[PDB]
Design a protein around this ligand. Structure first.
Ligand SMILES: [Zn+2]
Lengths: 184, 274, 139, 141, 37
RNA sequence: CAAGUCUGGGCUAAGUGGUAAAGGAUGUGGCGCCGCGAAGACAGCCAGGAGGUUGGCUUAGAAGCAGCCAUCCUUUAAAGA
């Protein structure tokens, strides 16, 4: 991914919104410079890209660094990304959220109930070198009942989860059934 | 109307039934009210003028009632006690039974389930005539509580106080309550009908019958016509002539027979609480 | 003296009554509505059940004719699995089964009807009717 | 219905509704959600009326999450009575909802159904609402 | 479904007309024949 | 009723203006993204629109067309169990 971004002198971070552009700022343990990018192209990329796949930013200084949207603050009353936070990756291993891929239909798929993505994103770590992706999770032998969590999964050539493990990644629960009444 | 007219009416047919034996008079064997057998709307209609005019009788003209039945769903077991010990004709009778619903069309079955003889030999006849009896007025509306099996599996007694009768009551109590307890259900009458109709009209013929709480059963062709069989409730079956002859401009004819009794759609349960 | 016909009725095995649709369509046929319950149940006295399609054609002198097709592809498959009824809910519940050959054997029995002139294609029409009645294919 | 089970104070003051939402302005659970456009007081009944018809519409469907929770005592003096004499008794409860707040959200259902059950819900509610999907609702801890 | 405040399409064959500043809605089944008011 | 029927650009066609809400709408202008695009599209005409097979279960009977499921195959230019 790419994204045209420019430096900001620091003048009217709100005159940019009205302008049309989204005020930003990228950084890391070395440098932090205030920036800003157009929305169109940020919706169009963040809409997809998100915080799983890196975004190489192109600045007027030839540079085109790799970063992960560590944070996107909103406008609550009407959601409109109002300011990002690009973390400039390096070589040093750093933490991010790798997407989980539920590949396999469980038993609640014939019985009933619903797969619950109680946590479709895990906090692992690894050198920006190894850019893993959808970390497949196995499902099938699951029926409206217990579930699975911990770190029971295919951890690529260097990924070393930074959660617990213990956090309930996902579970299957009882469907809502019209004919059900408890009040009385 | 008042028993007064109930007479002018007797004479009504006493001469009208000779001047036209193309009808039939019948006293509903279950509820006083009398039926007036006709051969088409108009028929009974114009009798209603003469029988009311040239006989000056002035009664009511609504529709027949339905011979309902009472029964239950769940099997129950309750105590039948009586005892009245104050000083002499003690009156001491008491029994326990096993009430259990039977298939809609089972009948009446009791069970002499007494081991050694905790309940003397001579008193069982009467403890039955008591149960058999009580079943007369249902727990819901008061109709022949039927389609069940009864089991007398216990009950004690007293050497001097007991009586043939004292037991007929105790047993008439055990029953008078098992039905109240086993969740009652207002059964009703279902008929067998066969409308002979040219499959021309058939289409709606079947429809109309469906929208009559009835459920269709078949149509094996006949002559140039075609016959339809099915069940229906006598309530939603009144004045059918002038309804069949409607969906058929006259080319329609039917018969009718009884079959079984069956639960009312609940919505018709609280309906009948009259 | 009624007019002519290529009647495409659909009568089962055994039930041969002059009763419609063997009446309105074969009333302009002069059809021996009873030279079927004999000519048919003679050849199908072997099978026993299964419907048998038929095309009864009339002419001028008031005579008829009729050629029959094969029994539903769902028939031979019910006996070839100890079945009678499908499986109520196809797919998830298997109540019997047919091998990769037992399907390729049936596609032979009805190959002169479908359309394809193969078996890798024909058999699939059979293997398709497998999940149509919940009868997996032994493989 | 729904409501607090215990309480330190049986009665509490009105207060005023402002903008913002303070939180719960993002998904986090289901796949599709319904959000408030105007600020207000949703009664327990209002909620229930919805949650129900919500489920009703898709008999045997996925899971519905009521992301809001009433807990503000609704007061009311008896009918035909003058001012004073203290406060009023409780009537029901309400949850103070503000714009940008995710009121409910469904999980595990065809989009067609999700976008419908929600549409109905919105009708039982006294305020205008929007149906959101799940894009940038990533990371909001 | 003649006069009303919420006039909509009750089956594809319906058509949202607007003759005379009034949103009418016509179809093949005289039942859908609406009109806002 | 004292002082511009003032100048340049834009919207509104109900007298809106000249005081009301949810909720309706091919209103009317204006920005947008995303599909099909003359290796023939939109409306369009004449065409075909099938055979396994009335899929299986259920039912009085369900044959694409109550309703459960299931949704594979086929000969094709293409035709959904
Ligand atoms: Zn319409």
């Amino acid at each position: 991914y790419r994204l045209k971004a420019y430096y900001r002198e620091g003048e009217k971070p709100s005159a940019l919104r009205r302008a049309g552009k989204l005020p930003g700022v990228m950084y890391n343990r070395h440098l932090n410079r205030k920036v800003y990018v157009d929305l169109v192209e940020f919706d169009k990329v963040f809409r997809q890209a998100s915080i799983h796949h890196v975004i190489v930013l192109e600045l007027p200084d030839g540079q085109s660094l790799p970063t992960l949207v560590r944070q996107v603050n909103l406008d609550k009353r009407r959601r409109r990304p109002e300011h990002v936070d690009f973390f400039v990756l390096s070589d040093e291993p750093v933490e991010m959220y790798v997407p989980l891929r539920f590949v396999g239909t469980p038993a609640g798929v014939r019985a009933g109930g619903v797969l619950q993505e109680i946590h479709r994103d895990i906090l692992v770590k690894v050198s920006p070198r190894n850019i893993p992706e959808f970390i497949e999770v196995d499902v099938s032998g699951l029926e409206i009942g217990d579930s699975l969590h911990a770190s029971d999964l295919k951890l690529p050539p260097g990924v070393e989860l930074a959660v617990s493990p213990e956090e309930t990644i996902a579970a299957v629960v009882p469907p809502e059934d019209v004919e059900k009444l408890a009040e009385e | 109307k008042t028993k007064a007219d109930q007479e002018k009416l007797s004479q009504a047919l006493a001469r009208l039934a000779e001047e036209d034996p193309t009808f039939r008079v019948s006293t509903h064997p279950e509820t006083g009210q009398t039926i007036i057998s006709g051969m088409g709307e108009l028929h009974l209609e114009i009798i209603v003028d003469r029988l009311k005019r040239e006989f000056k009788v002035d009664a009511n003209v609504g529709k027949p009632q339905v011979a309902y039945r009472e029964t239950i769903t769940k099997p129950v077991d309750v105590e039948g006690k009586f005892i009245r010990q104050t000083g002499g004709r003690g009156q001491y009778g008491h029994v326990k039974i096993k009430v259990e619903p039977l298939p809609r069309g089972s009948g009446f079955e009791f069970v002499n389930a007494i081991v050694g003889g905790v309940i003397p030999k001579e008193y069982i006849p009467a403890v039955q005539k008591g149960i058999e009896e009580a079943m007369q007025s249902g727990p819901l509306i008061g109709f022949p509580v039927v389609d069940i099996k009864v089991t007398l599996y216990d009950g004690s007694y007293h050497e001097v106080d007991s009586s043939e009768m004292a037991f007929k009551i105790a047993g008439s109590m055990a029953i008078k309550e098992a039905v109240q307890k086993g969740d009652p259900v207002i059964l009703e009458p279902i008929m067998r009908v066969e409308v002979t109709t040219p499959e021309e009209y058939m289409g709606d013929v079947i429809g109309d019958l469906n929208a009559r709480r009835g459920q269709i059963l078949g149509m094996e062709p006949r002559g140039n016509a075609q016959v339809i069989r099915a069940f229906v409730p006598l309530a939603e079956m009144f004045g059918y002539a002038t309804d069949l002859r409607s969906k058929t401009q006259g080319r329609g004819s039917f018969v009718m027979f009884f079959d079984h009794y069956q639960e009312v759609p609940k919505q018709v349960q609280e309906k009948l609480i009259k | 003296k009624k007019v002519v016909a290529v009647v495409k009725l659909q009568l089962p095995a055994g039930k041969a009554t002059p009763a419609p649709p063997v009446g309105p369509a074969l009333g302009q046929h002069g059809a021996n509505i009873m030279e079927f319950v004999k000519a048919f149940n003679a050849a199908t006295a072997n099978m026993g059940d299964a419907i048998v399609p038929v095309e009864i054609t009339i002419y001028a002198d008031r005579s008829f004719t009729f050629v029959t097709k094969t029994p539903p592809a769902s028939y031979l498959i019910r006996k070839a699995a100890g079945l009678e009824k499908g499986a109520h809910k196809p797919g998830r519940e298997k109540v019997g089964r047919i091998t990769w050959e037992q399907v390729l054997e049936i596609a032979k029995q009805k190959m002169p009807d479908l359309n394809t002139t193969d078996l890798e294609a024909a058999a699939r029409m059979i293997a398709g009717s497998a999940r149509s009645m919940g009868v997996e294919v032994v493989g | 219905m729904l409501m607090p089970r215990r309480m330190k104070y049986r009665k509490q003051q009105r207060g005023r509704l402002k903008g913002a939402t303070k939180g719960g302005d993002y998904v986090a659970f289901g796949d599709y959600g319904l959000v408030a456009l105007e600020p207000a007081w949703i009664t327990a009944q209002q909620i229930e009326a919805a949650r129900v018809a919500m489920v009703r519409h898709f008999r045997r469907g996925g899971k519905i999450f009521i992301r809001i929770f009433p807990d503000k005592p609704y007061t009311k003096k008896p009918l035909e009575v003058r001012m004073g004499k203290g406060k009023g008794n409780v009537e029901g409860y309400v949850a103070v909802v503000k714009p940008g707040r995710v009121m409910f959200e469904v999980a595990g259902v065809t989009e067609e159904q999700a976008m419908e059950a929600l549409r109905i819900a919105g009708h039982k509610l006294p305020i205008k609402t929007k149906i959101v999907r799940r894009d940038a609702y990533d990371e909001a801890q | 479904m003649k006069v009303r405040a919420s006039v909509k399409r009750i089956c594809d064959k319906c058509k949202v007309i607007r003759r005379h500043g009034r949103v009418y809605v016509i179809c093949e089944n005289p039942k859908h024949k609406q009109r806002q008011g």
